Amino acid sequence: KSVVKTSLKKNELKDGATIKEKCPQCGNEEMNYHTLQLRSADEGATVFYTCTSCGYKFRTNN
Amino acid sequence: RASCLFCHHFRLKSVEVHRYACKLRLLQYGLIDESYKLDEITL
Amino acid sequence: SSRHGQKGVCSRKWPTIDMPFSETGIQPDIIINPHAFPSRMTIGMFVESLAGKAGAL
Amino acid sequence: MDQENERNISRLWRAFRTVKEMVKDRGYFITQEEVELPLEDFKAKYCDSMGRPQRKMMSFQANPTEESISKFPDMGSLWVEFCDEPSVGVKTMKTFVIHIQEKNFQTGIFVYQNNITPSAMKLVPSIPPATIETFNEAALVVNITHHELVPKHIRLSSDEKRELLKRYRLKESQLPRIQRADPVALYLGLKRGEVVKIIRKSETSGRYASYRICM
Amino acid sequence: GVHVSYDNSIRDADGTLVQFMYGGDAIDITKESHMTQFEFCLDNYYALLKKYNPSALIEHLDVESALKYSKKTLKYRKKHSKEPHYKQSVKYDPVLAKYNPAKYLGSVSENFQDKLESFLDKNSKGVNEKKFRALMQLKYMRSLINPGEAVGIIASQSVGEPSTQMTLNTFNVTLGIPRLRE
Amino acid sequence: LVTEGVNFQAMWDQEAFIDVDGITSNDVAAVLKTYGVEAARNTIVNEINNVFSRYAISVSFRHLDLIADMMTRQGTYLAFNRQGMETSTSSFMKMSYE
Amino acid sequence: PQNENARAEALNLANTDSQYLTPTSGSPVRGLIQDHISAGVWLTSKDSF
Amino acid sequence: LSDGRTTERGSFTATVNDERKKLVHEFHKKLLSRGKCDNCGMFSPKFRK
Amino acid sequence: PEDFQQHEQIRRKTLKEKAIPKDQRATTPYMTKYERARILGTRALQISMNAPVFVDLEGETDPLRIAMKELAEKKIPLVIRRYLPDGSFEDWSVEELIVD
């Protein structure tokens, strides 16, 4: 009953953060990122990935 | 608190008290099936 | 430490004879490993490094 | 019109289909299509002409297969009983306490509907040669041995429990203990001191036989 | 102090049993990494022959027992492959339930037996099989557990050391260590 | 489907739309009450592996089968705590925990 | 250690050579590190004569 | 004892220890609360710490 | 007196009821990394206490590596007693075991 998008529908989230990195578990070259920096500042970029076809999760360690 | 100064037994009956003790004689041996067979004798 | 956050221990006091000379015969002072940078991405150390050239005259 | 009278027979049918899977598993002689007894053929035999069922018609008796008696040397007759009272009375048990004790079975099963009177629970172990196993018929909708997370239990006899406690040089009380009140130990009817065998399909190396004992 | 005993039953230090073989098939994780690399062990057959040297070896352990009782349960399982788990033919247990893998050549859990066979049925080109059934059932024999191994401690460090990584946070169900504490 | 609540007894009564021989939860203390103890064991090795998979840390099942068969040795879901250690034999281990 | 029942157990049970695979996943834990990787691309290249 | 199910020095395992503490925690459940001594009517009044 | 002897004959009857005899041994024929790291341990601690040696030791002062020289050539007079957890055991030798 509201006049703006109160919640998503089952298709209304189509991400596009394509980097051309190799996937071992499903070969989907497309793979998004997520924007964080986890450890204390004696540690590299913890700015993650996430594989986009088989549901594999990836950690950007260093 | 389970004691009485006049009968100098426990407040539970001397067949209820003997029933639990005689199970604990069995359970200091490696047998549990024969421990629940002592409750088959109630007459 | 430099002024960009690159700490590091003085791992080994290295003799100046077995240490690479340069254009002139200049031998360096602090060898820092270029594998340290891509986890850090401190390009401010790279632009400080060539403007120290361009400040030294 | 048939509001409750549609569900209460459909739930009772799978409850009956549960019981003719709880008896065949223990080793008795139940036929194939009696396990697969169709609801259309169920109501035309075990329900009244007004469509309501009577459970007094539904009770029966089972006798063990003599191949299983070659393994369990004394397995008596099994009696399956039902109840047409939502409130089981202590004198309803006295009808059924005697009917086991007089007829000289070995194993008894009482199916009820909502509850048993706790006063009626006093009469349950009071036939010492026999056993009485109660079951809530609302709790026996679906067999809990068909579910994928439960492996295929197999009860063992004396000539392989002795081939176990001598194999691994154990005592009785050193195996993994399964409870008395476990809904699989209430299913197969495990006494105390009867090792059951679990073939659990492990997640790594497939089928993996483990053993477990009832205390 | 949960340790493997000398008959492969996982037993706590006061005798009270836990499992009957270690994890199903009594293999250390530190030895199995090439155990399903059947393509690899075909390639380096002759080198891996004289590492797992059967010449001075196959006369001190039973051979032709586990090679035969397995093929009952290889044939007898071909009947009831289309069955659900409650309808299963429960006559025949697996081969490890009768035969110690440290003693009987060819006694093999039911997941490794079905994967050598699938390798010996699909990829067979001049490739023999009796040369290769020997090694990759002897390598299963060599790569067992050591009777006495501290699998009580070692499992409890397979929950500990990765857990200094799972403090990651929100981009439902409880996640990470506050799930694992429950 | 996913249900944000645990009630096995009412879901059996929904058999025309749910296959009632595949239902899987995370409340281990509810599977133990209904589905025996052997399904309370296969849930634990799933629920532990549902934590190390989302962070992509493939711990081996041989470690988890040992843990789940230690908690389920007495037929009940014994935790690792003061109350779970209360059944033990070697009594310095009890004193040296806390 | 201070006795010869331990000098064999610091060689044949707990050296850094039997500790090649971790038991958590079977993965290897020991390998070059930063520049010993980046010398491989230069040594095993097709221009490196 | 004529069998090998026990010794002279007895058998004591984890599940037997489980079945022993359950009685004693229930034995100390029953005897703590009661109306009278029941050999007789001769009973004692309560206590308090 | 004999209250030592009645105390002794029970033990040697107990100790005879736990030795699984040699035709009925049922453990591995291998030296499972724990015999091997301890047989080499204890034997190296015998050569440090003047045990009789039975190999051409070739200037090898290291007391641990001397036992390895006798391990790979089978000159060790040891017997491994492997306790099965009820108390029974199988007295394996070092000859009849097979090294990795």
Curated annotation (Swiss-Prot), chain A:
<feature type="binding site">
    <location>
        <position position="51"/>
    </location>
    <ligand>
        <name>Zn(2+) 2</name>
    </ligand>
</feature>
<feature type="binding site">
    <location>
        <position position="23"/>
    </location>
    <ligand>
        <name>Zn(2+) 2</name>
    </ligand>
</feature>
<comment type="subunit">
    <text>Component of the RNA polymerase I (Pol I) complex consisting of 14 subunits: RPA135, RPA190, RPC40, RPA14, RPB5, RPO26, RPA43, RPB8, RPA12, RPB10, RPC19, RPC10, RPA49 and RPA34. The complex is composed of a horseshoe-shaped core containing ten subunits (RPA135, RPA190, RPB5, RPO26, RPB8, RPB10, RPC10, RPA12, RPC19 and RPC40) where RPA135 and RPA190 form the DNA-binding cleft. Outside of the core, RPA14 and RPA43 form the stalk that mediates interactions with transcription initiation factors and newly synthesized RNA. Interacts with RPA2/RPA135.</text>
</comment>
<feature type="region of interest" description="Required for RNA cleavage, but not essential for elongation activity">
    <location>
        <begin position="16"/>
        <end position="62"/>
    </location>
</feature>
<comment type="similarity">
    <text>Belongs to the archaeal RpoM/eukaryotic RPA12/RPB9/RPC11 RNA polymerase family.</text>
</comment>
<feature type="binding site">
    <location>
        <position position="54"/>
    </location>
    <ligand>
        <name>Zn(2+) 2</name>
    </ligand>
</feature>
<feature type="zinc finger region" description="TFIIS-type">
    <location>
        <begin position="19"/>
        <end position="59"/>
    </location>
</feature>
<comment type="function">
    <text>DNA-dependent RNA polymerases catalyze the transcription of DNA into RNA using the four ribonucleoside triphosphates as substrates. Component of RNA polymerase I (Pol I) which synthesizes ribosomal RNA precursors. Besides, RNA polymerase I has intrinsic RNA cleavage activity. Proposed to contribute to the polymerase catalytic activity and form the polymerase active center together with the two largest subunits. Subunit RPA12 contributes a catalytic zinc ribbon that is required for RNA cleavage by Pol I. Involved in transcriptional termination.</text>
</comment>
<feature type="binding site">
    <location>
        <position position="26"/>
    </location>
    <ligand>
        <name>Zn(2+) 2</name>
    </ligand>
</feature>
<protein>
    <recommendedName>
        <fullName>DNA-directed RNA polymerase I subunit RPA12</fullName>
    </recommendedName>
</protein>
From Swiss-Prot, chain B:
<comment type="subunit">
    <text>Component of the RNA polymerase I (Pol I) complex consisting of 14 subunits: RPA135, RPA190, RPC40, RPA14, RPB5, RPO26, RPA43, RPB8, RPA12, RPB10, RPC19, RPC10, RPA49 and RPA34. The complex is composed of a horseshoe-shaped core containing ten subunits (RPA135, RPA190, RPB5, RPO26, RPB8, RPB10, RPC10, RPA12, RPC19 and RPC40) where RPA135 and RPA190 form the DNA-binding cleft. Outside of the core, RPA14 and RPA43 form the stalk that mediates interactions with transcription initiation factors and newly synthesized RNA.</text>
</comment>
<protein>
    <recommendedName>
        <fullName>DNA-directed RNA polymerase I subunit RPA190</fullName>
    </recommendedName>
</protein>
<comment type="similarity">
    <text>Belongs to the RNA polymerase beta' chain family.</text>
</comment>
<comment type="function">
    <text>DNA-dependent RNA polymerases catalyze the transcription of DNA into RNA using the four ribonucleoside triphosphates as substrates. Component of RNA polymerase I (Pol I) which synthesizes ribosomal RNA precursors. Besides, RNA polymerase I has intrinsic RNA cleavage activity. RPA190 and RPA135 both contribute to the polymerase catalytic activity and together form the Pol I active center. In addition, subunit RPA12 contributes a catalytic zinc ribbon that is required for RNA cleavage by Pol I.</text>
</comment>
<feature type="binding site">
    <location>
        <position position="7"/>
    </location>
    <ligand>
        <name>Zn(2+) 2</name>
    </ligand>
</feature>
<feature type="binding site">
    <location>
        <position position="4"/>
    </location>
    <ligand>
        <name>Zn(2+) 2</name>
    </ligand>
</feature>
Curated annotation (Swiss-Prot), chain D:
<dbReference type="GO" id="GO:0005666">
    <property type="term" value="C:RNA polymerase III complex"/>
</dbReference>
<dbReference type="GO" id="GO:0042254">
    <property type="term" value="P:ribosome biogenesis"/>
</dbReference>
<dbReference type="InterPro" id="IPR035913">
    <property type="entry name" value="RPB5-like_sf"/>
</dbReference>
<dbReference type="GO" id="GO:0005634">
    <property type="term" value="C:nucleus"/>
</dbReference>
<protein>
    <recommendedName>
        <fullName>DNA-directed RNA polymerases I, II, and III subunit RPABC1</fullName>
    </recommendedName>
</protein>
<dbReference type="Pfam" id="PF01191">
    <property type="entry name" value="RNA_pol_Rpb5_C"/>
</dbReference>
<keyword id="KW-0804">Transcription</keyword>
<comment type="similarity">
    <text>Belongs to the archaeal Rpo5/eukaryotic RPB5 RNA polymerase subunit family.</text>
</comment>
<dbReference type="GO" id="GO:0003677">
    <property type="term" value="F:DNA binding"/>
</dbReference>
<dbReference type="GO" id="GO:0042797">
    <property type="term" value="P:tRNA transcription by RNA polymerase III"/>
</dbReference>
<dbReference type="GO" id="GO:0006384">
    <property type="term" value="P:transcription initiation at RNA polymerase III promoter"/>
</dbReference>
<dbReference type="GO" id="GO:0006362">
    <property type="term" value="P:transcription elongation by RNA polymerase I"/>
</dbReference>
Swiss-Prot record, chain I:
<keyword id="KW-0690">Ribosome biogenesis</keyword>
<dbReference type="GO" id="GO:0042254">
    <property type="term" value="P:ribosome biogenesis"/>
</dbReference>
<comment type="function">
    <text>DNA-dependent RNA polymerases catalyze the transcription of DNA into RNA using the four ribonucleoside triphosphates as substrates. Common component of RNA polymerases I, II and III which synthesize ribosomal RNA precursors, mRNA precursors and many functional non-coding RNAs, and small RNAs, such as 5S rRNA and tRNAs, respectively. Pol II is the central component of the basal RNA polymerase II transcription machinery. RNA polymerases are composed of mobile elements that move relative to each other.</text>
</comment>
<dbReference type="GO" id="GO:0006386">
    <property type="term" value="P:termination of RNA polymerase III transcription"/>
</dbReference>
<keyword id="KW-0539">Nucleus</keyword>
<dbReference type="GO" id="GO:0006363">
    <property type="term" value="P:termination of RNA polymerase I transcription"/>
</dbReference>
<comment type="subunit">
    <text>Component of the RNA polymerase I (Pol I), RNA polymerase II (Pol II) and RNA polymerase III (Pol III) complexes. Component of the RNA polymerase I (Pol I) complex consisting of 14 subunits: RPA135, RPA190, RPC40, RPA14, RPB5, RPO26, RPA43, RPB8, RPA12, RPB10, RPC19, RPC10, RPA49 and RPA34. The complex is composed of a horseshoe-shaped core containing ten subunits (RPA135, RPA190, RPB5, RPO26, RPB8, RPB10, RPC10, RPA12, RPC19 and RPC40) where RPA135 and RPA190 form the DNA-binding cleft.</text>
</comment>
<dbReference type="GO" id="GO:0003677">
    <property type="term" value="F:DNA binding"/>
</dbReference>
<keyword id="KW-0963">Cytoplasm</keyword>
<dbReference type="GO" id="GO:0006383">
    <property type="term" value="P:transcription by RNA polymerase III"/>
</dbReference>
<dbReference type="GO" id="GO:0006368">
    <property type="term" value="P:transcription elongation by RNA polymerase II"/>
</dbReference>
<dbReference type="GO" id="GO:0001172">
    <property type="term" value="P:RNA-templated transcription"/>
</dbReference>
